[PDB]
Amino acid sequence: ENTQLSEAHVEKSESCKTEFASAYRAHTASASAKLRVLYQGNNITVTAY
Amino acid sequence: TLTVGFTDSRKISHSCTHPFHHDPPVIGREKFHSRPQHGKELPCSTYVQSTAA
Amino acid sequence: TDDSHDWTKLRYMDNHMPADAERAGLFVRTSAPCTITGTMGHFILARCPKGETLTVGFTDSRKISHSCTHPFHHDPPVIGREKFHSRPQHGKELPCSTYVQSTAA
Amino acid sequence: KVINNCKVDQCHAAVTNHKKWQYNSPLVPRNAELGDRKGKIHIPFPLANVTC
Amino acid sequence: NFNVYKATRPYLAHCPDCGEGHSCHSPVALERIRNEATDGTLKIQVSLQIGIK
Amino acid sequence: PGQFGDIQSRTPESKDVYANTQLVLQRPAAGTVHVPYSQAPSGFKYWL
Ligand SMILES: *[C@@H]1O[C@H](CO)[C@@H](O[C@@H]2O[C@H](CO)[C@@H](O[C@@H]3O[C@H](CO)[C@@H](O)[C@H](O[C@H]4O[C@H](CO)[C@@H](O)[C@H](O)[C@@H]4O)[C@@H]3O)[C@H](O)[C@H]2NC(C)=O)[C@H](O)[C@H]1NC(C)=O
Numbered sequence: 001e002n003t004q005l006s007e008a009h010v011e012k013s014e015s016c017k018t019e020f021a022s023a024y025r026a027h028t029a030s031a032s033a034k035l036r037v038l039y040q041g042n043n044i045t046v047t048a049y
Numbered sequence: 050t051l052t053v054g055f056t057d058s059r060k061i062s063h064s065c066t067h068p069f070h071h072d073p074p075v076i077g078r079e080k081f082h083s084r085p086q087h088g089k090e091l092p093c094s095t096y097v098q099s100t101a102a
Numbered sequence: 103t104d105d106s107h108d109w110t111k112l113r114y115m116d117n118h119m120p121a122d123a124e125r126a127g128l129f130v131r132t133s134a135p136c137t138i139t140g141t142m143g144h145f146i147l148a149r150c151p152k153g154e155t156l157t158v159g160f161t162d163s164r165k166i167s168h169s170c171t172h173p174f175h176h177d178p179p180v181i182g183r184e185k186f187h188s189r190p191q192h193g194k195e196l197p198c199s200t201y202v203q204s205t206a207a
Numbered sequence: 208k209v210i211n212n213c214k215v216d217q218c219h220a221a222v223t224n225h226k227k228w229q230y231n232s233p234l235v236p237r238n239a240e241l242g243d244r245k246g247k248i249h250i251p252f253p254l255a256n257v258t259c
Numbered sequence: 260n261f262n263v264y265k266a267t268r269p270y271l272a273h274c275p276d277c278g279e280g281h282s283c284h285s286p287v288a289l290e291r292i293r294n295e296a297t298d299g300t301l302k303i304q305v306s307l308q309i310g311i312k
Numbered sequence: 313p314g315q316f317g318d319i320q321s322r323t324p325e326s327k328d329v330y331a332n333t334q335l336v337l338q339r340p341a342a343g344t345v346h347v348p349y350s351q352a353p354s355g356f357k358y359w360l
């Protein structure tokens with residue numbers, strides 16, 4: 001007539017701070033470019049969206 | 050399996066064995082068995098020696 | 103060697119004379135050390151991990167290690183429908199055959 | 208103590224005055240419906256973020 | 260710090276395999292085996308207290 | 313359970329945890345004090 005009470009639950013481990021996977025949604029992309037131009041014999045570098 | 054044990058004060062051995070599938074995940078694209086002299090570095094996670102709170 | 107009983111000692115033949123050696127030196131090994139569940143005279147009851155060779159050895163009075171190795175495919179048959187590697191805390195009980203630790207002729 | 212007209216089969220004994228507290232492992236029974244709490248231990252060797 | 264175990268004592272716990280294939284109440288018993296680290300390090304929790312006598 | 317996303321949270325520091333691991337408590341074995349359970353293993357590890 002003895003009884004045992006067993007209870008348990010699920011928590012996120014502390015390792016969730018370090019080892020985790022981030023599930024994201026993606027939207028339009030902000031394209032950027034780096035370009036080298038031979039301008040009058042000089043190498044110039046530009047960077048623009 | 051995983052067995053942890055020690056020696057008693059009365060010079061008797063105590064040990065406990067639990068079934069446990071231990072197989073480290075592959076870091077990178079090569080299944081190696083010991084870290085090499087020459088190679089590459091990749092991110093990973095470890096247990097540091099720190100005993101603080 | 104005096105024909106008396108002492109569970110902490112064993113006797114090995116050295117040249118033409120029986121000699122005495124410590125039992126704690128005795129070891130049984132397949133690929134990792136086996137756990138010797140019992141000893142009596144010529145017979146040793148042990149539990150061994152999976153392996154293909156089996157060696158038995160000890161240390162004699164002159165602190166010289168002796169050992170013997172035989173090829174022996176040790177692979178316990180699977181009891182039940184799951185190939186477990188250690189005794190579990192929770193589960194089922196099935197018939198099996200073992201060597202009871204009784205020396206009673 | 209000695210108790211007369213008794214058999215070892217029909218008595219129960221236990222140690223109750225516990226002067227130290229242990230981890231509430233799932234391998235020991237609980238004292239009551241609620242937990243005694245009353246101690247706390249930090250788990251060492253935190254996960255940290257390195258190169259292999 | 261090490262000063263946390265001031266009023267704590269180890270405990271005996273059930274162990275499914277005490278070395279001879281028979282379950283018994285051992286001074287050392289495995290509670291949880293954590294392998295979150297990706298380099299293979301294991302953090303084994305046992306009923307013993309190591310470093311404090 | 314057992315797949316990517318068995319346990320979820322909005323941000324790593326958030327305390328809101330959603331878990332569907334199919335955790336069923338089982339009867340303890342006779343003569344023992346353990347707490348057995350049948351739980352689907354971590355879906356994150358299986359994904360890894
Ligand atoms: C180990 O290294 C990894 C990568 O090298 C690193 O992963 C990063 O973890 C942080 C959590 O600390 C993630 O969040 C970042 O943290 C900064 C802290 O300055 C926050 O500003 C940001 O967090 C917010 O970002 C979300 C973006 O929308 C917010 O919505 C949300 O509310 C967050 O609070 C920032 O994102 C970071 O995203 C990851 N990096 C990647 C690539 O996943 C980790 O921190 C390092 N340390 C440990 C202990 O693991």
Ligand SMILES: *[C@@H]1O[C@H](CO[C@@H]2O[C@@H](C)[C@@H](O)[C@@H](O)[C@@H]2O)[C@@H](O[C@@H]2O[C@H](CO)[C@@H](O[C@@H]3O[C@H](CO)[C@@H](O)[C@H](O)[C@@H]3O)[C@H](O)[C@H]2NC(C)=O)[C@H](O)[C@H]1NC(C)=O
Nearest residue numbers: 033034035036037038039040041042043044045046047048
């Ligand atoms: C302007 O830049 C172009 C190319 O941009 C270059 O890109 C990298 C290679 C870096 O060197 C950057 O610093 C640099 O801006 C230059 O053209 C390239 O010049 C190099 C000179 O080192 C040429 O390499 C040579 O190649 C020959 C033949 O293979 C070898 O024998 C030499 O030993 C040397 O390696 C390279 O071929 C050339 N690439 C072309 C022409 O497509 C350019 O010189 C530079 N001009 C100025 C004024 O700065």
